[PDB]
């Protein structure tokens with residue numbers, strides 16, 4: 263099996279797929295599509311949207327996967343990162359749903375001109391962003407372990423890291439002196455996963 | 466002796482997926498609808514401060530709280546064999562869910578806005594992402610190994626899809642008239658496959 267991850271942006275929707283693969287110790291090839299090449303490549307991608315995952319086997323047969331968090335969930339599930347009980351599974355999904363709500367605020371700021379981007383940033387950072395970070399903080403407090411859910415790595419952990427990095431892309435100081443539980447989550451995570459720590463250090 | 470209470474405000478909102486999976490599973494529950502007037506006082510009693518939420522009471526009267534609509538839905542669906550029976554069916558369940566939620570998110574752009582502003586946004590999405598997403602869902606449905614969204618039996622993907630199509634039609638009751646045969650065909654196949662849901666929806 264050759265796994266290829268096809269995407270536009272370096273820390274976009276593909277991050278959860280890449281992080282999931284990295285934490286599982288599964289090898290993959292990154293293929294980044296330029297803004298210039300997209301018109302040509304679009305019709306070749308089932309569904310016409312990125313990110314997408316092209317899996318090619320030993321005999322050269324191709325299976326396609328699309329919808330970032332559907333792919334992420336599938337891989338996580340295969341590598342035991344979707345919780346170990348129905349109840350852990352619920353808590354993995356709760357946190358993902360929370361992180362995705364936060365991500366959606368961030369998305370409001372994306373590919374807009376330097377001007378409109380900063381009016382939206384100011385609106386969300388005084389709006390749903392702190393509300394959602396508080397909700398995530400409380401969710402983290404309720405874990406039975408040191409990570410988002412239980413004591414071992416799940417998709418919840420990886421989706422959370424990616425969304426937090428997005429918030430700090432909007433205001434680098436936003437979590438400075440605040441949300442100890444979030445800061446602590448990342449500490450505990452990089453310790454449970456040398457791979458991810460190594461992946462994230464590089465970029 | 467679990468008492469399941471579904472707490473919400475809309476009525477055909479984010480709770481719908483929870484209600485529909487309970488209905489399909491033939492699991493009984495109580496609807497508690499929160500009025501605008503009552504929300505200020507009820508809000509601090511809901512963990513997370515957001516609806517919908519599910520309050521589960523045993524025969525002793527201990528409380529377990531569930532929040533995040535699609536985390537609750539997924540947990541219920543998983544418990545009742547509606548999240549696919551293989552890892553690949555599971556991926557396909559999530560793919561369709563992800564597609565439906567993209568559509569839902571366009572619909573949300575129109576909500577709780579004054580009549581005039583709502584008409585400007587409705588026109589934008591209906592000539593933009595809405596038809597693009599409906600075409601993607603149509604092709605997803607075509608790729609099913611059976612007559613429903615994934616395989617031949619009910620999954621969460623089926624219920625999330627019908628909820629989102631009803632939202633599209635709330636925006637323009639004619640939008641799918643003579644279009645998207647596979648979507649109409651899906652709902653047909655679904656009501657037939659689930660008397661309980663057909664009953665639930667007719668009323």
Ligand SMILES: N[C@H](CCC(=O)N[C@@H](CS)C(=O)NCC(=O)O)C(=O)O
Nearest residue numbers: 275310311312313329330331563567
């Ligand atoms: N539900 C999303 C859909 C992906 C999506 O909205 N892709 C955008 C960029 S992140 C895209 O490929 N736009 C190019 C196009 O649609 O032509 C996912 O997580 O996979």
Ligand SMILES: N[C@H](CCC(=O)N[C@@H](CS)C(=O)NCC(=O)O)C(=O)O
Nearest residue numbers: 359479514515516517532533534535
């Ligand atoms: N967590 C997401 C979203 C929850 C959400 O945005 N709920 C809103 C309305 S649909 C809410 O209860 N807001 C009340 C408030 O925040 O004061 C879900 O349950 O699907």
